[PDB]
RNA sequence: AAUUUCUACUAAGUGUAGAUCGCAUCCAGUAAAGC
DNA sequence: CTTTACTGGATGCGTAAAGGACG
DNA sequence: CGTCCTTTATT
C-alpha cells in the first residue's frame, strides 16, 4: 500500500497497440478491383531496392572522406589513453579530445556542400539519377518521384550514421569509441607479447598477408590507425590476428592462434588480440577464398546427380581407391603408413576389436628400454610415454603388423574393412537412386522437402565417412621410403575425392537456409504519408481517421479521388449515426511555437518587437550563461498573445497559463502548452451516408478488432485492450494519449486452410492438464491450429503515449530510499539464477525472516479451483535439444526465444504479485559482461531476458483487476523503475531493483554466518606443518564421534573479513567429491570422521591422544599431507552439488550454532514452511535479499538530504559482520 | 487446440488466464556443420 | 577461416503547419 | 489558384 501509491504519473513512455483490421461491407471488393494491394506489394519490394542503391551512394560518400581523412593529434590522444594514472582533472582532458575526434570526423562529412541534400528529395530526383549507370536502376528511382516523404524515416536512419555524439549507430562512434580502444588495447598487448613471435612467424604473416609492404610492428604504431578506418583496411588488420585462407587453400596462422599454441605447451595465460568491428554500411567481401553457394533448387540437383553418380569421377575415385586396398599385399608393408593422431584408437578397434591395443603395444616398446628396473612405473615414465606416442607422426604397416598377436594380419583385415565401407556407400545409392534419374522432378521445395534432404544427407555422410577414414592413411610424410608406386595412384584418387568437401559445404549452406516467405507490406493507399497523424485539420491530407459505432471502433480511409468525402457529412437526426473523431494535437511546443510565430507567413502579421528577433537568435531565454529571466518572460508573453490571435490553436484548445511572473524557465511554459494542447472529441455523422460512401468505393473502412471485442467473450480483457478503451473514455484526463504514426500492413496467408490440424466437431478432444477434472471437450465447431495464418489478415499498429505530461517529478532511486528509511517492516524479494533451478524466489521481512521460498522451474496458477502446473524448465530443455539435433541433421530449427519470453511473462507476473502483496523491493545479482559465458549449455540467457521484461513491466505496472481510474489501475499505473534507455546506462540500483554482488551469497552458513576463508590446496610439505600448528586445537571428541578443529582466523593469512574470528570446525556430516577418471557413479560421499580415523591409522597416528597438532606435524611423508588437504577441503566444502542430478545440491556447515546443531539444508528441504534455506539455491536468494536488508539498515541511519551519498554496494567485510550478528 | 501477437490452456462453448513497443536502421552475439 | 540458422542491443521516428512546386 | 507533396523546428 504505502510505498507504491507514491509512484504514479512519473515519466513519459510510449507503447504500441496492435489490432487485426476487418473490412466492412464492400470495402475489400473495391480494394481488389482497384489493384491497390498489388501496388503496395510491388512498392514494398521496390522500396527495399531503391534503399539498396541509396546505400551504394552513401557508402561512396562515406569512403570519400574516410579514405582521405587524417586525424589531428591522434598520437597525443593515444598517449593519454594508456596512462597508468589519470587524475580527475586529467580525466576530463581525455574526453575533450575524444569529443573533438568525433567532431573532427563528423564535421568532415558535413563539410561537403552536398551533405544536406543527402536527406532531401534531391537525392532521388537529382543526385542518384546521376550517380547510377544502370538503365533499370534509373527507372526504379523514377517511380518513386511522388513518394520521397516515405523515405523520411529512412533518412533519419542515415543521419544517425553521421552523428558526432556517442551514439551506437554513428560512424564517429565506430572509428573512435569502438575501433580505437580495441586498437589501442591491442597496442598494449603486443608490447607485452612481442616475445613469442619467431622472425619467420613475423615474416610469414608479413609474407602471406602484408606482402612486405609494411611490417607487422607497423600496425601497432599510433600513427597507422588511419589505415583501419575503412572496412577494406580492417580486413587486413583483422587478418593479422585471425589469419586468412588463400586461393591456394593454405591456412595461414595468425598472431592470436600463435599465442594460444605457446600457452597450450607452456600452460601460461597471455592475452589474445581483439579483432576490429566492421565499419558502418560496408559491403564487406571477405578475404578468405570460398566457393559460392548455389542460387536455386535446380542447381543443387544438377550438381548432386552429375558429381555423385556412379559415372562421376568422385565415385570412380572410390572405385579405384578400393582397388589399392584389395591389392594391398602387393605393395611394400614398409612403404604404407597410417597417420598418428587421437583418431587412431578407432583404428585399433576396426582390426581386432579393441581401442587401446595399438597404444598399449607401443607402450611396451618404449617402456622396456626406458624403464630401469628400480622404478617399474614412475609417473615420469608413464607420462613421458604420452609425449612420445603423439610425437610419432605415423606408423609403418609392418610396424603395426608386428604388434598384433597371430594369426591376424593387418593388411588382410584392412582388406576386410574397406570392402565393407564401399558397400555401405553403395547401399545409400540404392535408396537414393531416384534422385539421380534425368526425369525425376521435385514434389516440394528443398527446404520444405525433409524427405529428399535426408536422402542427400545420407549419401553425403556415407561418402564423407569413407574419405575421412582414408585420410589417416596419408601419414603426412615426409617419410624415408614411401611405396610411391602405391601413393602416386592414391594421391591421384584422393585429391579427386577431396572435391566432395566443397560440395558438402555448399549444399549444407543451401539446404539449411530458411525457406522463402512473404513478409507483410505496409499499405499506403497512394499517399506517401498515409495516416501519419490524426489531427482533424490534416484528415484531408493523410486520408484516414477513426469512427465509432458503440462498442466497436472502425478505421475509415478515403480514396485519393475523394479526399473530402467525410467532411461534407452532417448529423442525421432520426436514422443511425456514427461517432466521428475530432482529434486535435499540438506536438512539440519548443519546435512548433517558434516555427509558426517566426514563419514568413506570419512574421508580418505578428510584428515581434526588434528585441524578440534578437532574443531568440542570441538564445538568452535558454538556461545557461546566456539565460536571462526577463528576456525569457518576453518570449512567454509574446507566445501567449500570438496563440490567442491564432484561430486554429485558440479555438481548438482551452488554454490556462499561470502568471508569466511565476515561470522559472521557458520549459515550464512549453510544458503547459504541451499539456493543454491535446483534445479528443467526437461528432455525429450519418450511418446511411457513410455506408453509402463504402459501397460506392469512395471510402474504405475496417473494424479495429481483437478477440476481446467479440460478442462471445465474457472474460477479462487483454491488458492492451483496456488501454484502447481508455483513450476515448471521458475519465482519461490525458493519462494515455492517442499518438500519430500509425501503420497498416497486409500479411498474406502463409498456410492452406484445409491442410491445418483440425479437431473435428462433435468428436471428443482430450485435455492435457492432468489436474483438470474434465478430460474431454466435445465442441460443435472445428478448431484449426494456426487459423490466423490460413487467411489474409490486415494489421493496424497504433502508438500510444503514457504520461506525456508527468506531474510527479522527483528522483526515483531517492524516493525509494526515503520510504525504506521510514518503513518499519520492509520486505525484500530475492531472485537467484542457476542451471539446476532457472530462478528461485525468497521473500524476507525487515528482520530477515523467511515468509516464502519456492523454485520457479515450474509455474503454478489457479483459476476457479482449477490448478495447472507447467514445467517450463522441462519445455526449455526439450526445445533446446530440438534445435541442437535439428542443427546436426540439417532439419528445421525450432524457435526458442518466444518460449523463453512466454516463460518470463508468467514469472514477471509473479514478482509483481509479490511486490504488490508485500510492498517489497527486489534484489538481483550484480553481473557484468563476463558472467554471460558458461561452461555448459546455458539457459541463463533466460536471466538476461528476465531482467528486460521485468524492468519494462515495472516501468508502467498495472493490475487488470483494479479499477482503471484508481491508483495502480490502467490509467494510474505504478512506475517503480527508472525509464529503460539502455543496459549500459544502469547503476547499482534501479528504483525498486538492486543489483548486489554475489560474493559469499551461496557458500555461507545461514545458521551462523560461517564462511570458508581458508585456502587448502596443496603447496608443500612445509606449509602443511605451518597449517596444522596455526589451529587453536586439533582434537578427537569421543562422546560425539567427531573431530574438532578450533581456530582463530587471525593466525591464518588473508582472513581479515570474518567478524567472529574464533571458530570451532567439525567433521560432522557427509561430503561429496568428484572422481578424476564402468563405475556406477562419477562421485562418492566421503564420511569425514570415518576418514580422519582412516588417515590417522595409515601413518600410525594416535588421534585419540589428546591434542593432535604436534602429532600430525611429526610425519615426514608427502602422501599424508597431500591427502590431508582433501579431508580438509571437504570439511570446508559447504556447498555439495553434482551435475545433472536432481537429488544433490545441498549446503552443510561444519560449525555448531547457539544451540549446538549444524546446518544441514536437507533437514529443511523436506519442510513445507521452513525458516531457513532448503538448498544451496534458496540460500543464495535468501542472502541476496539480506544483502539488501543490510542496505536498508544503512538507509535507517542517514538523513534525507544525504541518502544519495549512501552506498548500497556492500563491502565484503561489512557483510560477514552482519551475517554472524543476525543470529 | 482458436489468439493483434507470444506462451500455457479448453477454462462450460467461435473461447480462458498472463504477458505484449511497433517500425526502420546500424551493429554484435550464440549454437551447428565443414575446413 | 567459412557458411547456414536464431537472437539481441542501441539508435531514430511515433507531427502540425509552413514551405514549395505544379497543372 | 487550389491541390498534393516536401520541408521544417528544437524545453
Ligand atoms: Li482475456
Ligand atoms: Li540455443
Ligand atoms: Li494437439
GROMACS .gro file of C-alpha atoms (C1' of nucleotides) in nm, chain A residues 121 146 148-149 527 560 564 591 595 616, chain D residues 2-11:
model
   20
  121UNK     CA    1   1.406   1.489  -5.223
  146UNK     CA    2   0.595   1.104  -5.587
  148UNK     CA    3   1.008   1.093  -5.126
  149UNK     CA    4   0.847   1.151  -4.784
  527UNK     CA    5  -0.015   0.856  -5.017
  560UNK     CA    6  -0.732   0.961  -5.332
  564UNK     CA    7  -1.303   1.541  -4.863
  591UNK     CA    8   0.965   2.344  -3.202
  595UNK     CA    9   0.819   2.769  -3.626
  616UNK     CA   10   1.563   3.407  -2.991
 1283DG     C1'   11  -0.630   2.509  -5.525
 1284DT     C1'   12  -0.407   2.081  -5.472
 1285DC     C1'   13  -0.080   1.745  -5.322
 1286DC     C1'   14   0.377   1.661  -5.187
 1287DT     C1'   15   0.812   1.837  -4.925
 1288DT     C1'   16   1.038   2.050  -4.577
 1289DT     C1'   17   1.086   2.224  -4.113
 1290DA     C1'   18   1.171   2.327  -3.570
 1291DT     C1'   19   1.413   2.210  -3.142
 1292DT     C1'   20   1.202   2.258  -2.341
   0.00000   0.00000   0.00000
